[PDB]
Amino acid sequence: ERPEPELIRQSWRCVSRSPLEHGTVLFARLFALEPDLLPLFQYNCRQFSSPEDCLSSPEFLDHIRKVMLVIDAAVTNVEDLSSLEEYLASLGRKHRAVGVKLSSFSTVGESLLYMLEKCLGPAFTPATRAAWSQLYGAVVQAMSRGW
Ligand code: HEM
């Protein structure tokens, strides 16, 4: 289904002003659901590979901001995601090459919905949750070409 654009745009405003705070919620959920992702971050951390320091490092914070900016790109292009097909395919290839499993992107989708739910509370309606599931599903499909 094409995600209902107004529901995507309005609900995104909840997180989009403070993207590091909200992206940090997403990542907390990601580690709660798939804690085995930590080593992949640790081994890619250049400044500090120990757990706490890697997770608080500029590289890791930068990556939280990158995740939120890619979702913002999908929100702002929700009516025509063809404008991100090559970017997303290449993004998938890049993750595959640093050892990420395609299946971990399902965990990310769960974490994104969790983040939104926490920000919006009862404004995160079933229609709005569905629209997000559809938008994220289209992003992962475009990325999945990289595996
Ligand atoms: C599933 C968990 C994820 C892991 C373990 C992960 C890990 C990484 C790693 C290690 C890099 C560095 C790649 C390199 O040096 O070539 C990277 C880059 C990046 N990641 Fe992720 N990532 C994840 C999910 C995501 C998601 C969901 C997005 C956005 C939807 C995203 C956006 C990016 C971007 C934009 C870059 C920069 C790519 C570039 O340099 O061209 N990541 N990620």
- Look up residue 132 and give its two tokens: 């997000």
Handedness of CA 92, 98, 99, 105 (dihedral sign): negative
The residue whose CB lies within 8 Å of the most ligand 1 atoms, and thus the one to mutate among 62, 76, 91, is: 91
Number of domains in the chain: 1
Distances (CA, A) of 33 to 51, 61, 105, 131: 17, 20, 12, 22
CA angle at 53 for the pair 97 and 44, rounded to the nearest 5° = 10
CA angle at 89 for the pair 100 and 54, rounded to the nearest 5° = 35
Which residue precedes each gap in the chain (C to N above 2.5 Å)?
none
- Look up residue 45 and give its two tokens: 């951390």
Dist. CA 121–CA 115, nearest whole Å: 10
Dist. CA 129–CA 147, nearest whole Å: 27
> Among the residues of 34-144, which ranges form H helices?
38-44, 51-56, 58-76, 85-97, 104-120, 126-144
User: What spacing in Å lies between the alpha carbon of 138 and ligand 1's midpoint?
Assistant: 17
The domain of 50 spans 1-147
- Pocket of ligand 1 from Cβ distances under 6 Å: 37, 40-41, 44, 63, 66-67, 70, 91, 94-95, 98, 100, 104-105, 108
What DSSP state is assigned to residue 18?
S
- Look up residue 86 and give its two tokens: 């090559």
Give the type of residue at 18.
S
Dist. CA 109–CA 139, nearest whole Å: 10
Dist. CA 76–CA 90, nearest whole Å: 19
Handedness of CA 86, 87, 92, 98 (dihedral sign): positive
Spatial contact of 23 and 68, defined as CB atoms under 8 Å apart: yes
Dist. CA 12–CA 51, nearest whole Å: 30
User: What spacing in Å lies between the alpha carbon of 95 and ligand 1's midpoint?
Assistant: 6
